[PDB]
Automatic annotation (TrEMBL):
Protein name as it appears in the record: (R)-mandelonitrile lyase
Species: Prunus dulcis
Active site, UniProt feature: H457, H495
Reaction catalysis annotation: (R)-mandelonitrile = benzaldehyde + hydrogen cyanide
Keyword vocabulary terms for this entry: Disulfide bond, FAD, Flavoprotein, Glycoprotein, Lyase, Signal
Record has rRNA-binding as a keyword: no
Amino acid sequence: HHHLANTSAHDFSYLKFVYNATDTSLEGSYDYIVIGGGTSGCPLAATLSEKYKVLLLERGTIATEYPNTLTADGFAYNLQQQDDGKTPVERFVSEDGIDNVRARILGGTTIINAGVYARANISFYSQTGIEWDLDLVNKTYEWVEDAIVVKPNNQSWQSVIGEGFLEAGILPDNGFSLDHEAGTRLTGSTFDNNGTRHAADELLNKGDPNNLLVAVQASVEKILFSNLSAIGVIYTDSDGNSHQAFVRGNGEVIVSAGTIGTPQLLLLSGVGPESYLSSLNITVVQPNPYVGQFVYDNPRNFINILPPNPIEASVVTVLGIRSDYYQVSLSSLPFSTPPFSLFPTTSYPLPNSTFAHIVSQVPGPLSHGSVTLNSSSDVRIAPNIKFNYYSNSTDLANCVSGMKKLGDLLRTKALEPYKARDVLGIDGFNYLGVPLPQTDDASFETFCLDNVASYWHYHGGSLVGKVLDDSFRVMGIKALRVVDASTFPYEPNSHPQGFYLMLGRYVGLQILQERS
Ligand SMILES: Cc1cc2nc3c(=O)[nH]c(=O)nc-3n(C[C@H](O)[C@H](O)[C@H](O)COP(=O)(O)OP(=O)(O)OC[C@H]3O[C@@H](n4cnc5c(N)ncnc54)[C@H](O)[C@@H]3O)c2cc1C
Ligand SMILES: *[C@@H]1O[C@H](CO)[C@@H](O)[C@H](O)[C@H]1NC(C)=O
Ligand SMILES: *[C@@H]1O[C@H](CO)[C@@H](O)[C@H](O)[C@H]1NC(C)=O
Ligand SMILES: *[C@@H]1O[C@H](CO)[C@@H](O)[C@H](O)[C@H]1NC(C)=O
Ligand SMILES: *[C@@H]1O[C@H](CO)[C@@H](O)[C@H](O)[C@H]1NC(C)=O
Ligand SMILES: *[C@@H]1O[C@H](CO)[C@@H](O)[C@H](O)[C@H]1NC(C)=O
Ligand SMILES: *[C@@H]1O[C@H](CO)[C@@H](O)[C@H](O)[C@H]1NC(C)=O
Ligand SMILES: N#C[C@H](O)c1ccccc1
């Protein structure tokens, strides 16, 4: 409010200091090296560059190469596009069997995501026990929001869903608010009112162009070490040739390669569980039993309704929040090619008309799994990942509560106009896929287990309190930090990009304050 961004084209001014990793003149010594130009990595690198020489290394290319990443209309397209190793969406399947994606592009997952912007639940900070500078946290949210967050305009389906949330008892009406609070609200979006996507790469425009260099298609393969200290990285370019870059003096390497990429790189570099790394004949630099451990994926459960008259497609902006479930709905055109991981399997029925995807998210979650290496040498080979969905019964109980609330939502007068048949029950809707069950808990448990998908908000693998201290330093190693979604075991809110955008700059400011 007051400070929020305006509608405007995507600002690629920063491309004036973006270079192909094939350029050997980038090799040398910097004050900071940031690995991964994503949600946390971009504002971290921009912030550090205000005073110091920074090299940001990103394995993907620049978003201008894939224009459908730059509009709200292109959201499904990037997920429908086949993964050829260069596309901004990298496809994967967890060992649980659930299809999923991660970003491979400068800007990270903010370039492919659903655009929902929220600040962290204000209780999160005290829950962590970290000594946060809370005033600075809030100044930093405003720094991000001034650049890339707007108040969304009205969308007919979002307004329907918001009336339904309220009628179904998800109270109070919070109006327009960026805050994760119980009740129903319109939140911010990183899509602007013209549908232009804004993203973490635009925060590079706040860096000092004399101090910040960005290398794209830079695949960082290994952290180099010396008092055990990180001293640099090895990265390879798109032609396959290798390159080295180093930090100097009191500088530091920061890993911002995401929930999947950060544990992978730590393990490949010999930071990780001693018996596991020894089992792979990877030389142990720093034993730590928790690298790649405590990896979480909040479950998404859903139904799809097919209204008898067309509904307008929308981006998610209206949120229904309770402590035990977070709910939204997306409306979408039909398609004959599925957006990968929207549904949990490729063998899911295709919609022939417009549909509403009505969704609940389990908080936490309490179930967790791990990231392990698939290759002990090649960072381009994706690691194995398993989330163990619903292995914790509290998660299953919370999904049951969310699914019952979705039942309530389907029974509201707000959603009544979208039934195919004017009958009393919710079997008057036409469904794509499996409808909601029956009244007893056992049928809701079965529905939750069988039809789970990824919410895409996975986190963990390099936790504060396990791998990192409260300053995000890797314990036992000087000049090495981790800043991204690998760092916390629970969500900060229903939609975490806002927290991790903030976190990139905030830790950058903490580093600079430490320096001084
Ligand atoms: C489809 C989808 C939709 C989403 N929608 C929303 C939403 O609407 N709202 C919301 O709040 N959250 C959303 N999220 C979640 C949120 O966007 C992510 O949790 C968050 O962006 C993760 O930030 P990160 O910095 O941890 O990772 P990333 O943003 O993915 O950054 C990691 C970067 O590191 C790079 N990298 C990895 N390994 C290496 C390496 N070895 N060398 C060099 N570079 C490397 C990657 O290419 C990537 O750019 C969505 C997620 C997905 C998948
Ligand atoms: C980098 O250069 C190689 C040729 O040496 C080219 O194939 C590749 O597309 C370039 N990448 C970018 C991001 O410009
Ligand atoms: C930070 O902002 C939130 C709103 O997002 C507000 O509730 C809180 O009081 C603020 N905290 C401080 C320390 O200013
Ligand atoms: C590790 O190396 C030893 C030889 O030093 C060999 O016996 C063992 O099979 C190797 N294990 C792996 C997983 O490569
Ligand atoms: C906010 O976080 C606190 C502390 O973890 C939790 O008790 C509360 O339920 C959360 N509120 C919402 C609306 O998620
Ligand atoms: C690597 O991933 C493949 C999937 O293509 C899987 O079949 C294989 O078991 C994995 N190997 C290791 C060592 O993780
Ligand atoms: C679930 O998680 C909680 C907290 O982490 C833990 O106490 C419990 O043992 C786990 N398992 C089940 C089945 O609740
Ligand atoms: N992330 C996120 C949004 O909530 C979302 C967007 C599309 C489908 C499900 C959920």
